[PDB]
Amino acid sequence: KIFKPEELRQALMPTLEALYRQDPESLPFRQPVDPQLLGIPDYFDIVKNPMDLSTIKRKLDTGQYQEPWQYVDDVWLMFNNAWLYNRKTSRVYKFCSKLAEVFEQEIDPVMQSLG
């Protein structure tokens, strides 16, 4: 019913690690999209709620998720931003799809264990 922050973090962290461990597929996701540096000023017109692995880890590390679904929501947010913004055959889009494949395989038992 109520989750202890360090147990939530401990349960969920392996699924985040699984994504980080994807090389090269995690690489575009390990840090926030910076549209200024990238010269893509349209990015925040399309992606209103940016999300990336570094931000997810920080939130997981600083008790910012009270329930497991808020974490799942952020991972899906990351994916959905990338699938909306990028070409289907782009490196980023293909990479994202791999992260989603890994995440689907990792999350389901963890959500089962958590209740």
Author numbering: 1083 to 1197
Task: Provide excerpts from the study.
The 61 BRDs in the human genome cluster into eight families based on structure/sequence similarity. Despite large sequence variations, all BRD modules share a conserved fold that comprises a left-handed bundle of four α helices (αZ, αA, αB, αC), linked by loop regions of variable length (ZA and BC loops), which line the Kac binding site and determine binding specificity. The four helices form a deep cavity that is extended by the two loop regions (ZA and BC loops), creating a largely hydrophobic Kac binding pocket.
Cocrystal structures with peptides have demonstrated that Kac is recognized by a central deep hydrophobic cavity, where it is anchored by a hydrogen bond to an asparagine residue present in most BRDs (Owen et al., 2000). An asparagine residue that anchors Kac by formation of a critical hydrogen bond initiates the BC loop. Indeed, ITC experiments showed that the binding affinity of many BRDs was significantly increased for multiply modified peptides. For example, the KD of CREBBP decreased from 733 μM for H3K14ac to 131 μM for H3pS10K14acK18ac suggesting that many BRDs recognize a pattern of modifications rather than a single Kac mark.
